């Protein structure tokens, strides 16, 4: 059963258990109490299945350890950083923590019933701790600082994955995730779709607004940039529109460059069909120039 350290044996005022008054108030509401000064029993705490507390200025969930049966936690738009108090919530199934600053993800390591996790807009770069959640079904990681998604190769139960608005170029870790149905990858740095070829169960796929930044090359009148953009079959994607009246002579994008232009670009576009999913693979390759 629960740890004695995580159980109350006497009626205890809410405010003494939940150190952050915002979270204490949340519990008071959940339990329909008049005030955080009111006592609660463990039986009352055990009855909490779901906490909805978005946009509540919560800085700490200290005390939540006393809620062994909580399965759903909606905590979007708060001021959380540390999620250690969640560690032993073995029944947690849904955890929404968008718009916080949660980075220490190994506190989730023993949440083996967690099926849906949302951590959008947390400033996260390191998702390695997610390796301990192989049962995950939905994962939302939009608007973060992620580059390395290596660990996602272990999340073979995901059917929904959002990685939009990160800094990802290497999507090879996704290649074996054939259970995927909804995959959101817009606003990354993706130029090569080979990784997606086998995702036969996709229904929704977003691949637009990629930004691909090349290392600077020398400014010269006859400028050449090799096209590196690849479709799911490995073939080059012909540029859509090339800046500065440039042209494409496969495989090279070419410009007759003016002295006063110091960066060129091209937009690429490829319609993608993978199983039922139809997607716009779209982006821009930017080529800064140096003297």
UniProtKB/Swiss-Prot annotation:
Name of the protein in its database record: Internalin B
Record domain LRRCT: where: 211-291
Domain text: The N-terminus (36-79) resembles a truncated EF hand, the LRR region (80-240) has a curved form, while residues 241-321 form an Ig-like region; the whole region forms a curved tube. The LRR domain alone (31-241) binds mammalian MET and stimulates its Tyr-phosphorylation; the LRR plus Ig-like region (36-321) are required for receptor dimerization; adding the B-repeat allows the protein to scatter host cell colonies, and the GW domains, especially GW2 and GW3, potentiate MET activation.
Coiled-coil segments on the chain, per record: none
Stretches forming LRR repeats: 45-67, 68-91, 93-111, 112-133, 134-157, 159-177, 178-201
Reported consequences of knocking out the gene: Deletion of inlB alone decreases host cell entry; the reduction varies from 99% to 37% depending on the cell line tested.
Domain of life: Bacteria
Source lineage: Bacteria, Bacillati, Bacillota, Bacilli, Bacillales
Assembly and oligomerization: Interacts via its LRR repeats plus the Ig-like region with the extracellular portion (residues 25-741) of its receptor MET; MET can bind HGF, its endogenous ligand, and InlB simultaneously. Probably forms a dimer upon interaction with host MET, which subsequently allows dimerization of the host MET and subsequent host signaling; dimerization probably occurs via the convex surface of InlB. Prevention of dimerization does not block interaction with MET but prevents downstream action.
Function of the molecule: Mediates the entry of L.monocytogenes into normally non-phagocytic mammalian host cells. Its host receptor is hepatocyte growth factor receptor (HGF receptor, a tyrosine kinase, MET) which is tyrosine-phosphorylated in response to InlB. Downstream targets MAPK1/MAPK3 (Erk1/2) and AKT are phosphorylated in response to InlB, which also causes cell colony scattering. Complement component 1 Q subcomponent-binding protein (gC1q-R, C1QBP) has been suggested to also act an InlB receptor, but this is less certain.
LRRNT domain span: 6-46
Region annotated Ig-like region, chain positions: 211-289
Subcellular location: Secreted; Cytoplasm; Cell membrane
Family classification: Belongs to the internalin family.
């Amino acid at each position: 059963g629960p740890l004695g350290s995580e159980t109350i044996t006497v009626p205890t005022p809410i405010k003494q258990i939940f150190s952050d008054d915002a979270f204490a108030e949340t519990i008071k509401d959940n339990l329909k109490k008049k005030s955080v000064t009111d006592a609660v029993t463990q039986n009352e705490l055990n009855s909490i299945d779901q906490i909805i507390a978005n946009n509540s200025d919560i800085k700490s969930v200290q005390g939540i350890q006393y809620l062994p049966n909580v399965t759903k936690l909606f905590l979007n738009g708060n001021k959380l950083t540390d999620i250690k108090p969640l560690a032993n919530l073995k029944n947690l199934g849904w955890l929404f923590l968008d718009e916080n600053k949660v980075k220490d993800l190994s506190s989730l390591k023993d949440l083996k019933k967690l099926k849906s996790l949302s951590l959008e807009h947390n400033g996260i770069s390191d998702i390695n701790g997610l390796v301990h959640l192989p049962q995950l079904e939905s994962l939302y990681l939009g608007n973060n600082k992620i580059t390395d998604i290596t660990v996602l190769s272990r999340l073979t139960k995901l059917d929904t994955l959002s990685l939009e608005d990160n800094q990802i170029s290497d999507i090879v870790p996704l290649a074996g995730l054939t259970k995927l149905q909804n995959l959101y990858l817009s606003k990354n740095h993706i130029s090569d779709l080979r990784a997606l070829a086998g995702l036969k169960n996709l229904d929704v796929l977003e691949l637009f607004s990629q930004e691909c930044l090349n290392k600077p090359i020398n400014h010269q009148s006859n400028l050449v940039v090799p096209n590196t953009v690849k479709n799911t079959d490995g073939s080059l994607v012909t540029p859509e529109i090339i800046s500065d009246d440039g042209d494409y002579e496969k495989p090279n994008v070419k410009w007759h460059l003016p002295e006063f232009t110091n960066e060129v670009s091209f937009i690429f576009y490829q319609p993608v069909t993978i199983g039922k999913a139809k997607a716009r693979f779209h982006g821009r390759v930017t080529q800064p120039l140096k003297e």
